[model samples]
Target chain A: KNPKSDKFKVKRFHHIEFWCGDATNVARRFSWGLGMRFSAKSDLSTGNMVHASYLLTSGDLRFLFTAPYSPSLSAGEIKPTTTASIPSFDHGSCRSFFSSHGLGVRAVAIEVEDAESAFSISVANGAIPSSPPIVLNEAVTIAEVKLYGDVVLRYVSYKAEFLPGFERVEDASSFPLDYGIRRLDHAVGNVPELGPALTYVAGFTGFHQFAEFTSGLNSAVLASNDEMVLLPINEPVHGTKRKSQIQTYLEHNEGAGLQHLALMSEDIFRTLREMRKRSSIGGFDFMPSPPPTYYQNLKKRVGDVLSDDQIKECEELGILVDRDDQGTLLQIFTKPLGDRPTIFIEIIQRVGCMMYQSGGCGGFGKGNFSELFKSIEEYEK
Target chain B: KNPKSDKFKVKRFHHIEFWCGDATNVARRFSWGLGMRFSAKSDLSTGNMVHASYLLTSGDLRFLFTAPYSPSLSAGEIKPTTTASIPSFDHGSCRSFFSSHGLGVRAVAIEVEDAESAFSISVANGAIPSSPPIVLNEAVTIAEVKLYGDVVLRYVSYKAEFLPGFERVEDASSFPLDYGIRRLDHAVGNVPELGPALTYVAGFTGFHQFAEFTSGLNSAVLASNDEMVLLPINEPVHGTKRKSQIQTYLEHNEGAGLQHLALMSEDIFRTLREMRKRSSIGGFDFMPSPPPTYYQNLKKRVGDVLSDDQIKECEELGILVDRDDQGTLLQIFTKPLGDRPTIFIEIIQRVGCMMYQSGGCGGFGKGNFSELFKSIEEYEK
Candidate 1:
């Protein structure tokens, strides 16, 4: 862990906020499909007159879905106040964000020790300010900086709770039962170029360059000092025979943004079983299972990391298994969350890495990237 | 029947198309929640580079959902050809539609005897043309005209397949089982002023004014000679003690637009039972049940239209029943299809009406409107 590279450090990912066209339905998608519990909300009832928002949580995973309200907020003001700029969003601004990237992640919030210091340090390191620091109370503060392709990287500290205007959901029990998702493991962002973004994020947050891959795309993973927050910054490779997956994401998403989020699951088998049930009932679509050849050769590649029965189940559930020298990884992906082929969900369980401080386990399945890309290419065709 | 008022006659409603942010998810909501079958789709794989679309059907009922694609179509083109201007939509136009009205019905299509005459006659009668008639083949033609708000009233003739771009879904069996929905009984549109809009439609289409309601809101229902096509045009009353529902719709939707559609079913009890099941499973939310007094007084007002057991089922399922001099109507409504409370769906079954041509079986629930509005007011509060 590189602790000395910054004035303030991100403890981990605080939450992710998606700017959507229909916050209630989009929020319901997660609450229904992934077992995220409806935690809080801000709307007309809560005196939030501009936009509607739904805050959902599963374990430590925080997700905020927001959409523009008609007769929207006046576009002239830039409040940048406590709620991380949600209140200041004009109808045009919100629509533009959603138009550029359908139901895409607009902000990736990182919990920091000091929000004021994080902002100053980020700006000092040449980060572009989307909004200045805003104090919510004696214990909470927040600020935002422009990240890749219309997304913002927010720094939050001394924090917590579902923003200033939100009230607790009246009856969360009315929502669907919980799935086995534990928390967010990592968030991956696709960009046109990776070097500048990687350097920018690394410089401001003082994140350690953990690892990267070059098989299907150029990517670099950065992690916080405590090893909790991992971000995979990716870019499309040039001179490839097939269209780069990152390129497709960039085009289909209109531009770069948060691509996918990996949610940690304790027992992926049970989680997969429940989720597959929902998918069958028209919840979400999973990619087709890999070929039998992949299953036959799986034990040879992953070796003793998984038992024979586990490998058999992996194939049956269409779960992808990968390994590094330290441990093995079992993960599966959902189709794009919306119509644009952009944001998606990843269910991942990391097994036995040397150090799983917050979960940089199994090296992000570097070996699985090729097979996953192949499947995606085939699926698209 | 006012047959001389229209130069070309409309046989029935062909379909209602919604401009959505995520066609797949929205379509899934209806498929999973409402029992609409996923009949066909058009996407990148189908060579529909401009946008994504899904066509759903239940018996004679048809609903189409469309979304703007990324790297969207070029802005300057106006290909007023086959497809009734769907191809002419730039991403900006599509996004604008969604922003102005979240998940709104963009077009209400009527199956006319001749598309060419319908377009020409409507234009001659002072109807504003959204697009001129476009002939697809020797027997098929389509055209469009501006309806209230940003919606279009499309006249289609000799059109039998899902548009030119869509292909049959690869595996219909994989989709969830269909609900017992039958067809479109009627469609409602909210407008700022009832007079001019009503006159405009009546002047062009030669529709008979079937019924009008002055309680809660001002509404007029117009129907075809055969009584198949029914339209409820509504306007908010200014001097009400409380806010008018139509006014609320207008503000939330940004302007006048298609409000809700009543979908017919032979066995509404069975259909509603299945829908309630889906609702419990987190598919869609139904409005909260009315108070016990409302259910108790229901039979006294409607009399012998429903049996004690049926009324018992009505309370259990939260179904609303109403009766007029002509017949009895059983219905239930869904919450707004999106966040803004703009559009919604109604499941209805009729009994003992004098005539049921295409489907105008019972009255359009004038008596139930007061109770529904009261419920909406309480819920909003």
Candidate 2:
């Protein structure tokens, strides 16, 4: 049962979709804050009647958003917007999803070798079928399956481009800005039980167990056949001294779902610096640095993979550093992106490792898990 | 029955509270866009357990926002955040409100002579009581009543400051910005029928009818005894060629509610300029101006109360100008603040009129209503 021998291999993340209350402004939160360019749009003006959506992108990252054009009147005579002929991707469930959680990730999509095959295989391997494979266009086919809790795992066939209905939107940003961010390296989901969740994912996608660790909560990382997509499933370690951070996210999110996303960057120093510059004007808010004692022994823990000045910049930017036998990882997490402490983002960079290889860098920052979560507890309080 | 001789009187607006999904970022939209200063905040750190709130102000304008700490766990143990012993303040309705409408004005609070008298009289006169008068502190008393649609008409006893739980938050903005907005000139609401709504309002508040107009839809303005608080209620005109805009608001909002708020400014030219300057950076999007022909006849319609250069500036900034027998008014409407096309804002400046008098200027903009509403139709499509 070698995972790399599977025919239904995932190439990479196609796009992550967020169901929001207001797609226009909420998408603005991403573009204005994180330098994600507004690439395409679909709405009443473009003939889609069920929902208004915006597709945003960075280097290789894509974020798609949809908001109900008229939630209550959808089943009624929806005018000025429509629903009869438009692709109602998930507008039927959009209300309850947004009602339960303001703006949370609804789907983490991946590109697959074959959508029909992927769906059949996933369902055959115990994945709950959400939607059957449908040829959205002559070139692309798509299908969906239930994942973790209240989230979607979408599989798109090899051929696709901006779905089928989106119209290209020119970037109207007046200022030229770049955050130097790249693609999604990995996505973490908080589940009630880590072992079964990883097992469930592994069975469907031919993903192999990559790593396991426990600072307090149990965590297990899984990688796809080609190691292009990574999933870290976390669960609360019960009966501990304090409530588990994963438990906090579960309660806040109303159930298990995508907790945070790790975005890759080649030059994290410049990325963090530019990201910090916009924080004063409604950008990402980074968690505070660990106590002075934590960084004073930086050289002892990571063994001089970086210069002294480079380490100083890390401290100044509230970035966390961690290393393993293989390589050093530079990472930092932004505060929960919304009012509820549900979903967030991580800015990460890998040093001394080939790009897009197994366990990209620093083994998911195992040494920094406790430090970041504890810092959040204080920040949340 | 003379309204000005009534024993009970409302001095002015106390504060308009917005029930949103994320108070921190949502409030930032107002501050960074409208130049409102963040004056106070109450969260887990400040001991506001039920909700995290931020109060922003510009001159006499006060906006309060509250978002649920944890919706599902509100009645449960709600750790790190709480609900018990906290000022719930319609948090029970907060979910349904934000669920139905993304971000909307929940209450248009008024400072009354006596909170108890206001409540009893309001109930005695057939105004549905939402909450009993509660003495929050020695200096403050607040009560609530149902307004049109799913909104609240809050009554507050005078002699209050910063509410009960808010902690002072310094203006952390690095750049000094001013939109020149001074106070709430008036607030308008969309109702199914304007006549009965005004009758209901007059029975309790002793408001005198100020003006009435019919430009595709029926509209009526009401003034408090001192004329400090003005309310303009609008209703749909049936059997039109297209859908009525007021009816459109009701459909999108899911019910009757506040339509728009007019913020008064002494120099609207400067206000429009400053507001437009920030529109590119996540600020308000104003409605397009009327045709060039509308401005070409400025001297014939309103006389030369303003300079040619001033009218040129209005044409440039998409501002609209209207006048009555008494004085001139310059006003402009912003696009819907959220994606729902529900609530919006208006910037208005009065010319050759006493400050804060009955019908402050331009007799409530009857001349500009049709021109603006018709423009919104094409823009919405």
DockQ for every model, please. 0.48, 0.37
True contacts kept of 2: 0.31
lDDT of 2 by residue, A1-381 (tens): 224744376788888888876776677667667777778787766766567888888888898977776556566554333442223365658767866765788889888889889999889988888878877647777888888888888888856348777788744433334587779999889999887887788877667877788644998878876666888889999898888888888887788989998998868988888888766565677876776555656666664677777777887888898887788888999988877778999999888756544455567888776655655566555
lDDT of 2 by residue, B1-381 (tens): 224733366788878888876776676667767877777777766755467787778888888877776555556554334432224365558877876766789888888889889989888887888878876646677888887887778888856356666677744433344578778888888999888898888777777877788744898888887667888889989898877988888888888899999998867888878778767566777876676666666656665787787777888887787888888888889988887778999998877656545456667777776655655565565
Give the TM-score of chain A, superposed on the true chain A, for all candidates in the order listed.
0.91, 0.90
Clashing pairs in 2: A49-A82
Error of 2 at A14 (Å): 1.8
List, in the given order, the native-contact fraction of each candidate: 0.46, 0.31
Model 2 Cα shift for residue B197 (angstroms): 1.0
Local distance difference test values of all predictions, in order: 0.78, 0.76
Report the C-alpha lDDT of model 1 over B1-61, residue by residue, as the tens digit.
Answer: 4443455778988899988887877776667777777888787667666778888888888
Scored by DockQ, the top model is 1
CAPRI classification of candidate 2: acceptable
